[model samples]
Target chain A: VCDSTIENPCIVQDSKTQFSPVIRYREVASIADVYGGNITGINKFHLSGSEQPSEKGWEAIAESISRKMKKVIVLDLRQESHGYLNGRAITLVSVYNWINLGKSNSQSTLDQENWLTGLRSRKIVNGVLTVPQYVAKQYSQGKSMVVSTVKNEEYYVYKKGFDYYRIFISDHRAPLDSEVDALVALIKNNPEDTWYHVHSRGGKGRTTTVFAMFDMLKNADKVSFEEIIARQASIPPFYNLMVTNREIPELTPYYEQRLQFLIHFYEFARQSLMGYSGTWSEWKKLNI
Target chain B: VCDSTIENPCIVQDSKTQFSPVIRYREVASIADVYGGNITGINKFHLSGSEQPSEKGWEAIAESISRKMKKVIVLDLRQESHGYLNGRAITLVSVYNWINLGKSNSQSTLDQENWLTGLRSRKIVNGVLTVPQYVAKQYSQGKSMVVSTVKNEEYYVYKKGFDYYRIFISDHRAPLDSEVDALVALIKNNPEDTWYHVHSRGGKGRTTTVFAMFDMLKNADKVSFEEIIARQASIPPFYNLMVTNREIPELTPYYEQRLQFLIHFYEFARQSLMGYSGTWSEWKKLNI
Candidate 1:
């Protein structure tokens, strides 16, 4: 372990924060000697609540997302690197008309008509939904189409309840055999609304998982786990991939897998933690 | 005056091979005592120019100008200024237009036809100006309008003949009365066309000149030398005051007499140097 002082703020040696300064240095040196690593840090973005001093900051980030919006989860370079580099350029990606594929109250068996209304109120949508203001404005322009339906049962919120609304919301992942086929079909049919930050304990298997998703997407661009870890091993959000209609080489696959990985990984962890040893017969076990 | 050293190509000052460092600590200290000066240095630009080797360089100057284009002339804390202090900023204002303020063909007299044509050629009046293809495109798209009138207007060119193609080439000290009047008017009318740099010469005049220009521009929002530099001791080019357009304070009445003093002082010096003086009155009479 490298000494704490010797460990550059920009470099990465995961889980070595509490080591003795001498041990830290030694460990850092070892990592650097092998990986040519340098300690790095990243600019952290917290949820900018409504009370932000200036909305300009949020607006700028929005504009940045719009201009450089991609269909892949774009990782923040600073967080993934050693310590924060002095002049790291920002990377951005955006997702629009996102449709989360996981189950919501819409799929529940209970007499959840009222609950479904709550979910809709909370911006959980199924298709091309029009916001109420958007519909009213369209109607004012003498457009025949109502705000409620466009095509394929698309809908829009007709009134402002919360500050904003969403078209779709989901919590889906891979490795759930019961819902795997449905989720996979949904991903195939609607590839625009998914994003994954592919980051975890470094392993070659991560790259394989990412490539498998890429293969499914028919997108043959660079997607390697090492590219993730090799790019920024220390950052937890290294696998942060964004998915959209546009094809991003690494992101398409990584996100596809990440969507699968999240649900399955969480499910597996849940099962083990709950003392239910129903291990997957074919799936390889992974360390968190 | 200084010892020659072949080891390092340098600006000479005194008999020493060492670098002729421009700033003298003693001089800096003396000025600080009176004016409460503060010395500072910074790397302000993100340069992308000819790199000497592995080091990366950026164009902070260009970035600063671009920021100004977007109506932000203040120091850009991110891409512009590397650091700052409470002390004043020193900038040497160089006028590319000044050097070619009076250039003209030998055959052309100072007539209306030639003057109009000259103005058109410089793109100040109506006529298509020769520009790079990209600049022409940008001009069509409503970007840059002004065109260089001097032969050496191109940046990073050592060939003097390649400067701006202008008719009237001006100098530091206007040798003619009309030239001075016209130059002053141009600066007043077109503040946006000028390029300014700050180079501190380690003196009170240097700092005061900057302050004076800032004050002048701030007050009148134009360049005015006669209106600003009213004192007999107003320094050369007096660009700081000229651009600032500041009013000469009442206590600095001597500063306003610069032109009057220059006429008298230089005339005396001319007579003395020529060794033609019988008496001051006699010499004046003879000269007249």
Candidate 2:
């Protein structure tokens, strides 16, 4: 069931988990063709979250796929099976099952460029979970890659046939301005590539942060920052998920304070790097 | 089943999983009584890992438990059910099955102090494991505590009748100087408490870093750093598990670079903090 006139439409719902009211371009899949009859918008369809097709969410996703399957592009953003702080990370099963993509048996050249592609662990060591030694080594180096960068931003790029996929690792904390720049560069570099999937463990907090930053950069000249945040806030998995009593602004509580961070991140990008020589009061007065 | 004198002893073998030689402390359980006869040690028995008792591994741990069962404490270092950088994270079933401690039903006062005690999510969301929202909130705040401490380290304390427990969180990276000090303080402060279970998701890398650091500190004046390191290297999970040629010096590869971090952490703690004034060369010469 699709409702085009509604401001925030429900795109997908799973019968098994009963976790529903899934939103398009947010929870299940971002539809590029659904936008405006070849108006030439952002053709990227970013699919995320831990939900997978059963044996499930993907079925709901398939409906949208029928509408727009001219040329599909897939990108996975899971870093094997490792997460930070607590164990609030995504799993390989969730990624693999949803995408319906099997771990390639033959050694592909993409695995050489990004170790994540080659990392497949069948052994459940000590019940805790273990990747192979070689896989573990590559994961270690990739983590170190985070701090090694001058601006603390790290990403890996892989190309398969005509499709290109990139995974950028962030600690799930707020991204630094340089990290935003890094993502902006990726988006700019891959103008021809469709279906840019940005994901993190929960695919909520970190994913939204990176996605919002990208949106701001893409529409900086065309739209206001407030409109970008409003669009993000209106989406499912984020809409009403974080803030309660949205009508009462003071009563609202945002997840990880992400709503505020979204605004601050864009402001930093515009003022500091992009030569937006304007006072904060003047900027907000014109925008907000 | 038991070979005390053998290098890298084989304690348990699972017929079903075929995962064998599970390390005592790292894999099964770390026994304190085995070190020496009545040494007035930390009588703490730390048990961890995702491996269970059904088919194997528990046999080795059960033998050690018979020697002394003064008190038993369990600590779970897994996230609700998530991770994906390396295989260095934990799942809820892994914690529940291995520790065999279900989420306590009915409100225990300790659960009130920390929601982790009461957190029990039976329903799996999106095929990804789910912890209750309350649990997730507490975990997020708990992570922030790691940064706010005066020493840049933080831990939570839980007391159950006679047995008191502490859960310290680390990112599985090399510890900061203050983080090691914070752990040192925890060990010193909780001397009366028996059973100090150090755990991470995979139960090897982060667990060993804290365990080794604590061991070195406990025997700082009495033993040489080399002896402490040797004891650590002799352990099952960390020893031959990672490195192939133990006899050779240059051919050792430790996962997550944990071995090197353990050493570098101690050096920082000894050099940066108080009372150990001698050069490492002189100190090892005298102590070893």
Candidate 3:
């Protein structure tokens, strides 16, 4: 009924069919155990082909992701639209799914953070407000809401919860150094949390790219980049952020560029083990 | 308008919204070259949480499972019902998705085999046939069509072309010895074609069980049951048929029985490699 793009961020997903619940889901990493000895590894980070999960579908995602946490972080890597060229513009709709889709911040969604949790969906139809209207009104008042970024050139940073942090990178291209910093800082700053989820439109490109970045940020000090990529690719979809064996020739460069960025991030990660923990953007300015 | 359960097999899915297309899809195994070595592993086997693929959703499934083959095999393991208790009871609707949903086999479906591809949907509405109609028509004519099964207790063997083979097994249960033989015969019998796919309702229980069974039938001679289950589980969706860590206590017994069955199949498989090629039923009857 509302803008579906805002409703479901998955490029290939159709949110209308929430009737059939299931997302293109996969386990990214198993978090420490709230109860790991159990049949299910209760705590684990997961990835999926991008989507705005329906009630049960989101539950399924959570079933695989949450070990013991009440509020889980579901990071969105999509711009309001899918990506540039296909959908290059950055708008409210681009980051819609990550915010509260409620008409106002009074009710809670199925997620229990529910209606009042998000007010991004409030836009003024006749007189009342939807996320769209609310976002505009806040900005019109000289206050930036739901559209905050530092350099702003990197990517849009929504909110953070370990609970719900969203970094908006377009579809095909690699995320910028600054964007990588946002993710690195969030993850490094928060080690107690076991699982984190990251998603993009296709769940293939941007989603995977960030997944690699995650390993570099968290595990680069110990594991090799090759193994990092291999283990990550093996987890499921088997597409690697470090390789381009499956894409077309025109897109090979796109992946290669993405791959190069990952390599740089990986290099930064390895170095971070030596006590020089600087932002990827800051590191690149001096080191790369 | 009609039964959505019949229209969508995912226990956790909603099918009414067909507009946003993407399914809980994943590569089961990569088939031989339809043009492999490119960016994508075009030829491959796949699995998903049970689904009656919406038009475009079906296309996405094909995009991963297909490489060079025009018509690919999609094995369904639901018993006209999810299993025995969770809405169990095999009926026309249980195996509906594999058969063409068309009123008759005369229409081509999105798969290109299209509307005319299936007659299962033909039910006699007043005079014309829906699969439900065509099936009843043939059975009443002394032609036991679409409902053929030998030693019927094992499981219902739907049809085959290596094109589309469906075997009905209740959810959360091990496939019978005869059922194991049926799968063994199919894989051993087909060589040039390298990839196969299997799915039950959840894509978790019956689906993973068969995927493990597939490994035993196809690669047991070269792989150990432990590695076979580990590797298969590693592929994505990561549920192994040989283990029961993720399920409830009530279901642990179900998985153990299923695991034991896989072990037996693996034993039979090892012998088949030593010049003792025989069906699992025959081998088990003599050896076990």
Separately for all candidates shown, the number of backbone clashes (residues 3 or more apart, or on different chains) is: 105, 15, 76
Give the candidate order by descending DockQ.
3, 1, 2
Model 3: docking quality category: incorrect
- A64 Cα displacement, candidate 2 (Å): 4.3
Error of 3 at A187 (Å): 1.3
Candidate 1 local lDDT, B1-288, one digit each (tens): 111122211111111111222231111112223332221110111111110100001133334334543111111101000110011111111121121224332212222223323332455322221223222232222122253321101111111111111113122222233322322333343335343332222222333332333223232223233333442123233233223223434424434343343344345334454554443344445664
What are the lDDT figures for the candidates, one per model? Answer: 0.25, 0.36, 0.48
DockQ of each: 0.02, 0.01, 0.02
Give candidate 3's total backbone clashes: 76
Ranking by TM-score: 3, 2, 1
lDDT of 3 by residue, A63-181 (tens): 44443233445677654322111112222332334433322222212332222123223332112223344444432222222312111111222212335665656556777555677
Identify the leading candidate in terms of TM-score: 3
Docking class of 1: incorrect
Candidate 2 deviant stretches above 4 angstroms:
A1-66, A70-172, A176-178, A240-261, A268-288, B1-288
User: What does candidate 1's lDDT look like per residue over A56-149, in tens digits?
Assistant: 2223333333432224231110111111011111111012111222334233212123323332343222221123322233322211211221
- Model 1 CA lDDT for position A34: 20
